[PDB]
Structure formats: structure tokens, C-alpha cells
Amino acid sequence: QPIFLNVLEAIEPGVVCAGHDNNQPDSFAALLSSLNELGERQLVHVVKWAKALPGFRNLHVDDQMAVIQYSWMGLMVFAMGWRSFTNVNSRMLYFAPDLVFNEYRMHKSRMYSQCVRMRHLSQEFGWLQITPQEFLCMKALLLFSIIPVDGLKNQKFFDELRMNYIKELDRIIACKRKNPTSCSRRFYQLTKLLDSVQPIARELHQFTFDLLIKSHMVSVDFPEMMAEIISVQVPKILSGKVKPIYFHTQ
Numbered sequence: 001q002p003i004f005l006n007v008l009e010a011i012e013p014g015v016v017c018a019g020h021d022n023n024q025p026d027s028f029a030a031l032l033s034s035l036n037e038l039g040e041r042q043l044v045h046v047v048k049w050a051k052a053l054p055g056f057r058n059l060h061v062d063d064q065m066a067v068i069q070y071s072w073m074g075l076m077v078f079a080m081g082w083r084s085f086t087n088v089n090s091r092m093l094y095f096a097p098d099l100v101f102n103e104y105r106m107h108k109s110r111m112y113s114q115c116v117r118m119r120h121l122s123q124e125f126g127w128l129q130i131t132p133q134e135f136l137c138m139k140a141l142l143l144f145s146i147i148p149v150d151g152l153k154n155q156k157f158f159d160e161l162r163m164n165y166i167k168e169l170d171r172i173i174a175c176k177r178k179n180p181t182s183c184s185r186r187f188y189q190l191t192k193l194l195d196s197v198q199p200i201a202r203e204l205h206q207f208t209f210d211l212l213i214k215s216h217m218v219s220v221d222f223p224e225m226m227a228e229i230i231s232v233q234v235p236k237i238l239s240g241k242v243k244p245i246y247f248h249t250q
């Protein structure tokens with residue numbers, strides 16, 4: 001049986017609530033405070049999910065938390081895009097069952113341009129007819145798609161893991177294709193899609209970083225873990241010390 005895919009399906013997180021009050025009028029402060037809370041909650045699930053991935057424990061302990069803290073934005077945006085596609089055909093951004101963004105909220109969040117890119121990603125799942133299984137393997141690969149320019153504690157273990165997840169993606173593409181030209185076209189499409197997540201994540205990193213710095217001035221609350229990661233890890237990315245791994249040369 002499909003052992004790798006069996007695992008990915010088994011560990012996939014369930015629904016996560018934001019806790020937002022949908023009876024109160026929309027506002028920048030309320031919307032972003034709710035998104036930040038959702039981030040804190042989702043992070044807990046992402047950590048447990050990551051820790052349960054095949055071969056994850058092969059990584060040095062320090063590298064395990066590092067990759068999670070560098071890739072969380074991309075991982076969460078990719079999953080949100082998938083949820084939006086499956087639940088509302090990318091019409092709105094389905095952050096959570098209790099936090100669905102319509103155009104009004106996209107504007108009130110002062111994140112309209114970023115929401116546009118996130119919604120575009122969501123539409124790609126439909127345009128490219130991405131399968132639930134392709135989604136699972138791609139999301140797993142996103143965890144191993146951003147590292148320090150000077151390397152990790154034990155880079156060899158990481159390189160081996162990333163290699164194996166790329167191999168599993170190629171395997172999923174061939175599980176219903178006889179012509180190699182079709183496999184190659186699909187792999188090209190999927191790697192392009194994966195790359196497209198990085199620029200979106202970077203824009204969100206810049207936005208949340210700026211928001212944190214001025215959080216006290218605009219009444220936006222940041223939970224413990226979010227404030228830590230955004231002030232300690234995110235800047236490493238924005239300053240170019242940690243960079244995404246692209247398939248194609250940008």
C-alpha cells in the first residue's frame with residue numbers, strides 16, 4: 001500500500017478555529033488580532049504535524065525547530081489557499097470557519113494587495129487541477145524549502161530529507177502517467193507553483209514585521225509565540241540571512 005501517502009493523510013491537521021466575533025463590525029485592529037491568534041493556534045498544529053512527518057526526526061533537534069520557524073508562513077498560506085479552493089472555490093480567503101475574508105475584509109485588513117496574491121494562489125489549485133495528494137506532498141516539501149545561507153547544524157541530513165520528498169512528489173506524478181512527457185510537464189507545473197509561494201510569504205513577512213513594530217500604536221495584539229518568531233526569526237529572512245530554495249531561477 002501507499003505508505004508515504006498513508007502517513008501524510010493520517011497526520012494532516014483538522015480544522016482550526018480563530019475565535020473571531022463575527023457579530024462585531026469589521027475593523028483593522030479586530031481582524032488582525034484575530035489573524036494573529038489564528039497564527040498562534042495554527043503554529044501548535046504545524047509543530048505537531050511537522051514532528052510526525054516521515055524522516056523528520058533524522059534532523060538535528062535545533063534544525064527541526066529552525067525549519068518550522070522559517071517555513072510556517074509559506075506552509076500556512078499554502079494550506080489556507082487549499083482550504084479556500086475546496087470550500088469556496090477561491091471566491092474568498094478561508095482563513096478559518098469563523099474567519100472568512102470577503103473583499104470588504106481584505107480592504108479593512110489593510111492587506112488587500114497581499115490578499116490578492118493569496119487568492120491568486122488559491123485559484124491555481126483549480127486552474128492546475130491539483131489533487132488532494134499532490135497538495136499533501138507539496139505542502140510537506142514547503143517545510144524543507146527555506147534555510148540559512150550559511151547552512152543548518154547538520155545540513156547533510158536536511159539535504160537527504162529534501163531529496164526524498166522531491167522523489168515522493170515525482171512518484172505521485174507518475175502513479176497515473178505512462179508517457180514521460182506528461183510527467184515532466186506536471187513536475188514543471190508543480191515546482192513552478194511551489195516557487196510562487198515564496199514571494200507571497202515574503203510580502204506577508206514584511207507586513208507582519210512592520211505591524212509588530214507598530215503594534216502598540218494601532219491596537220493590534222500579538223500572542224507570545226508570534227511576537228517571538230516575528231522579532232527573532234522573520235528578520236533573518238528579511239535581512240537575507242535565511243533564504244528560500246527555488247526550483248527555477250527567478
Ligand SMILES: C[C@]12CC[C@H]3[C@@H](CCC4=CC(=O)CC[C@@]43C)[C@@H]1CC[C@@H]2O
Nearest residue numbers: 035036038039042076077080095204208
Ligand atoms: C502574520 C499574520 C497572522 C497569521 C496569518 C498571516 C496571513 C496568512 C495566515 C494564514 C492562515 O490560515 C493562518 C494565519 C496566518 C499565518 C497574517 C499576516 C499579518 C498577520 O500578522
